[PDB]
Symmetry: D2
Subunit: 431 residues, 4 copies
């Protein structure tokens, strides 16, 4: 089963990243084999959303948070003025662009606008959504979404210039949970807003709503965010409680694409340490996912597909598991081909090469997608331009530790230019 690859890659490789637990035949055996001495090796795949506020607004502090692992900056429009939020956005952009001198240092960071909330779309939300479009935000976290028409109202308020902005619906009350299917259908993703949910429904039922919503989003292949009070005590203390570390680990094990920090980064005394703690827990929890059952169940539950991007994605993930591929390099214009690979939860990192700065920021919503922004002008021959981008992903991957000489990588491309034509999977040996 694993004997030839154990001889080739070594016993040390197979003792890391919870690989003994990954090879177990049952979920019970998988738990029994989890090992505190089995170190994570893969890059952290669950994105961290940090709320920006008084403790995390300065350019110097934002540079530290980007280095600690922040992928998405959340602006809570329930507090502060438009002037206050515009300055936060400018500071985030200055900190992000301070690393732009090279693909080895650059890390795209998405900007998300979290609305104040509502009897339908409020007048303040209309003004805040217009502010978001004018300031080029990547994502909207829509507060108190209760039905599909609430999403349509947010979409209309973004106007024709905001068509590319992702709408993540926040489920915060009983109606949102009950009408979940209709809301998910029209949203780009979901946020389990546990703060309000824990007041709107009995506190002892929140975990059921969280697990159900994460499961349904995983089945739909749409991003899901777990939010609120994940590391709450870290607002005043340098180390979290045992329940808080457990909560972050279990959100990742449940299947969350993103985890969030609110007061921990907006007002707390340890914003950088809170990001570092979520980073450390998420890497441990990602390695502990039982991929054997998860991949089997995602295949069994997902309907058959005639979409070549979907068909190539499952073949690429299956191939990555067969050879313990270090990465899956994918070319993408909108992020969709990377999202379809992410839905099958590969252990291999999905390195997404794109010319779209906005798609590079938005793909942080999908677990395990590492965006690489390609800035070179197009080659005269399209096939050469595709090859250059694949080589850019390989060289960036090698220079950044994702790839090593001798590794196998899976490369996912399409047959013609433009979004929607991904249909090729190639197995390449890194030299």
């Amino acid at each position: 089963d694993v004997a030839q690859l154990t001889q080739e890659l070594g016993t040390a490789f197979f003792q890391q990243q919870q690989l003994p637990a990954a090879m177990a035949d049952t979920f019970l055996e998988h738990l029994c084999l989890l090992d505190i001495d089995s170190e994570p090796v893969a890059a952290r795949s669950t994105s961290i959303i940090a709320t920006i506020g008084p403790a995390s607004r300065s350019v110097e502090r934002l540079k530290e948070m980007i280095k600690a692992g922040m992928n998405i900056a959340r602006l809570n429009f329930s507090h502060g003025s438009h002037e206050y939020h515009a300055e936060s956005i400018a500071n985030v952009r200055e900190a992000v662009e301070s690393f732009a001198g090279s693909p080895l240092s650059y890390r795209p960071v998405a900007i998300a606008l979290d609305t104040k909330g509502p009897p339908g779309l409020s007048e303040q939300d209309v003004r805040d959504l217009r502010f978001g479009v004018e300031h080029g935000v990547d994502i909207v976290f829509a507060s108190f979404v209760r039905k599909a028409s609430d999403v349509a109202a947010v979409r209309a308020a973004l106007g024709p210039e905001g068509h590319g902005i992702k709408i993540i619906s926040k489920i915060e009350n009983h109606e949102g949970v009950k009408r979940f299917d209709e809301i998910l259908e029209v949203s780009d993703g979901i946020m389990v807003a546990r703060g309000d949910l824990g007041i709107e429904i009995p506190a002892e039922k929140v975990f059921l709503a969280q697990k159900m919503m994460i499961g349904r989003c995983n089945l739909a292949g749409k991003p899901v965010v777990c939010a609120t009070q994940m590391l709450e005590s870290m607002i005043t203390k340098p180390r979290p409680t045992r329940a808080e570390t457990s909560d972050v680990a279990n959100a990742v094990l449940d299947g969350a694409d993103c985890i969030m920090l609110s007061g921990e980064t907006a007002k707390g005394n340890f914003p950088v340490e809170a990001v570092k703690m979520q980073h450390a827990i998420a890497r441990e929890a990602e390695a502990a996912v039982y991929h054997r059952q998860l991949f089997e169940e995602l295949r069994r539950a997902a309907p058959l597909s005639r979409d070549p991007t979907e068909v190539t994605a499952i073949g690429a993930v299956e191939a990555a598991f067969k050879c313990c591929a270090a990465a899956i390099i994918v070319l993408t214009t909108t992020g969709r081909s990377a999202q379809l690979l992410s839905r099958y939860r590969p252990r291999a990192a999905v390195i997404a090469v794109t010319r779209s700065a906005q798609a590079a920021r938005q793909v942080h919503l999908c677990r395990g997608v590492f965006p690489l922004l390609y800035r070179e002008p197009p080659e005269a021959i399209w096939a050469d331009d595709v090859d250059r981008r694949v080589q850019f992903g390989i060289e960036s991957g090698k220079l950044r530790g994702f790839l090593r000489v001798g590794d196998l990588v899976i490369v996912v491309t399409g047959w013609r230019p433009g979004s929607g034509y991904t249909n090729i999977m190639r197995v390449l040996s890194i030299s």
Copy 2:
């Protein structure tokens, strides 16, 4: 009738995959089964009053923990007396036994631990939570310090450091059960690795059929606040979903301002989480991993649990002298409540360590005809079950008994209709 299959997450229970099971979990599907995960409450100034202890017993406290890292022997003797007074204040059909557990100060075996363990035997404690167990010889030392008079006391080894996790298998083999002592574990190993040690230890204890306790900071914010954080409710629910037999409260009940509410909160979460367990996979995996056995108690237990699942039995009523027959039923995680009828006050207290075991203390002297004595105890289990809401007329129950008096002879399973 019809609403039965809507409740207790039964639509999610019938799912063909774990992913579909999650997708079918419903916040409107109310729990019906009695809460199976026992609650351990640490005794302290917030919970020493006899009147406060009566409220904690009513709220759901099953085991009272005495932390010997604080207070003198005189202090702990008063704690024991107050717990016993509150427990004995309670109507034999509704009486709830409450175990007393002694949690040692810790270290080899210290001289203070030798004195504290002798105090425990002299005061009749049921369980010892042995601190900082690092190897099998630590358990043997605790057992020797309990002496010949403490042979019946259960030893739960607390795993609190790297060595304890690494030598886990040898420790589990000689212990009655384990406690995942997350407080010290979270200081001894990186905080971000504690969940791995917790999940591994719970999985291994579930495989071994031995009790496992999840402990420390589960509802920490309720020491000062009336409602817990979202991470705390998640932590309690995930400990139950992981497979913990018991969950614990430390500062929340010993020194905080909401000891009764903290017990009520663990009770409420545990009931919701138990209904959300995917028994289809869990039972299949426990059966597959459990070795073949020639012990009639073990063979009867798996047959009884299989029968209970076939008919959606409301309960499995088992007669037990030491608690062993109830423990062997519990290891297969039936959805049916295991109602354990015993004359041993100590066994009635100790079986709270096993998930889904509801002990009933039978006080009547033995009937002259042994089959009549067995029947009267089964009827006592039924009448208690009806009064407490476990059973109703028309329910099916599985009754587990043995072929002769004395411990060790369980060998019969019977399907009974409640009249």
Copy 3:
């Protein structure tokens, strides 16, 4: 390790196949009953004694040939051969008598007369030819008069309509026969295996007996050894889930009737050990609906307990055979030793795979619990004499809480002393 136990412990069906071993000898008693057709080659009392010793459990009388007088003589000869072993408990074996009708536009006049002959001669089973719909079964049931309601009706599926209306036929029948001879002429020959596998699967799911019939060892009508396809066919019928396997021309007119019975016995024993019980039991459990019938609930608990301890046997007390049939439906590896006072139920339970009938004729004890104990001990002592059990073995015992049929609700684990 014997009885394919290394293959039994495999985690996948593919691994199970890879671990099958020609040197792993079968130990369990043969569980699939053998039905032999009685005719010119197998009618004599001396030949019938050899067929009983070789393993024949059910004698089939084909009413498409011969007179009532001819068949009455065959029945008398079978009964004389069976009773010749009534002095030795080690060799006495009940043998069922099955009447196979000539067939039909509805119930034929000849079938009414032949079914009446069956009732008058005390036959145990009817193999009803060309059953095409539920009303055909109702007609056979009505023709079984006021005296034969206890006779089992096994519907023969022999044409396209019978296959298409299978669910309605199975619902009203006691069991099914896959009558491959006519089926292979009525539908394309290359589709018969699909109908066979589907019908066996559905009968296994319903917990009703299914017989695989016709041309299983055909070449043995003239040759002393079968072809490689014929041994394969018998083994695959057992692996498919057939409760019984049948011989027609091989025993009725062939030159090697005893050898044909011996060959089916030898193959069935090898094939039964090769069954992948791990998957079979899991799938039977998952597909069977929840039940509030204590006999059904006790049966699954007893089979689960037998697997847990590798029990040598499950001893069950039964008056009608129903408690043994409900144990058989879960396909335990342990032999189901059925202790009954009903001579008819003892003959009829041969239709259920793995049921070994023991006819008990002691007068009833005044104290019911003592009468139950005496019968359980009779099953144990017969099991020891026949090689099923030894001192130290574990056995599962299934009984009810009060006398009379329909109250099975107890499972006990006993250590043999």
Copy 4:
């Protein structure tokens, strides 16, 4: 629905059996190859043409009987019949030499040399009892016989007991039930057959089920119920090939025997429970860093996701098609090759349909690869494998020559 698709979607093997339907017609092309023994009843060119049309894929020459001159004439007649057949529909037919048997006999050395000189594709080596027997056959084939496939016949107790060492050095196995049924108890042959088929399926190597499959058809026009069951169960067991011996070599109904195996195999292939089979084969196949192996599992997974009508693969030696076949896709594996020997030999692998490419070469290697893929599509449409609107998976490599398969592409037809 057709091709037992209701049974294919079942959640358990038991439910799969319950859903099998005699009215659900097979649509896929027959995947299990038929080996027919050539003899007096099937030697003529006219008879051989009818056998090729009926479905014969491999012609077996039994060197236990007849002279070298007799077998050379049989080979010439098979080749004349094959070459009588339109490049988009041409069907390659392999020639297999079945040795007399024993260490290596002097007669076998002469017969193996005859085989090399006459360009046989396969050797069915009789009575293989250990790895050194396979080495001796390989040595007797010499340097000119390097490309010939050796299928070891397991015929006795020793061969069964030393099976793993024999399989390791052989190209495949034949379950030679005739001798096996005399060497071991007849009632144990099914265990040896099921074990050997299971182990060959795990190893990804061809396995042949042989002897007395349709025996009664030597004198009768229709087989017995046990014979149709035997053929169906060999396919369900996982056999890559099924064989006819006396039925085609000396019987009165050789063509009808081939037609009967074709009809049963098609029905049995649709009745395979792919949901369990693919999951088990995928789980048991070892992890690998070989790009052909990695591409093969990705291609089979992709084919199942979209209900692909076919997987078109370019192959020089047949290896890339064999690695796809080992995962038992429901999609036909259309193997496009320029090697006539590889086209003949790939009949040993279930579900591989060889197409011998004889179109003019393109100047640009990438255009030449594209035209070979288009040839597979056009041939597929003509033969009924593909229709406009179908999805196909295409498996190719990054450079010319064997061993470089590393690409899988999803293509919509027309």
